[PDB]
């Protein structure tokens, strides 16, 4: 699915979304 960030930190060098879900893109890293 996606995955929730941990203490404001995500693994796999991914980025935390505004919804608390990890992922990629400018909407996640921006």
Q: 22 by DSSP, 3-state: which?
A: strand
Q: Experimental method used, please?
A: NMR
With contact defined as beta carbons under 8 Å apart, do 24 and 15 qualify? yes
With contact defined as beta carbons under 8 Å apart, do 2 and 11 qualify? no
What span, in angstroms and rounded, lies between the C-alpha atoms of 29 and 1? 18
DSSP secondary structure code for residue 21 in this structure: B
DSSP secondary structure code for residue 27 in this structure: H
């Amino acid at each position: 699915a996606a995955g929730q960030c941990y203490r404001g930190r995500c693994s796999g060098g991914l980025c935390c979304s505004k919804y608390g879900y990890c992922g990629s893109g400018p909407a996640y890293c921006g």
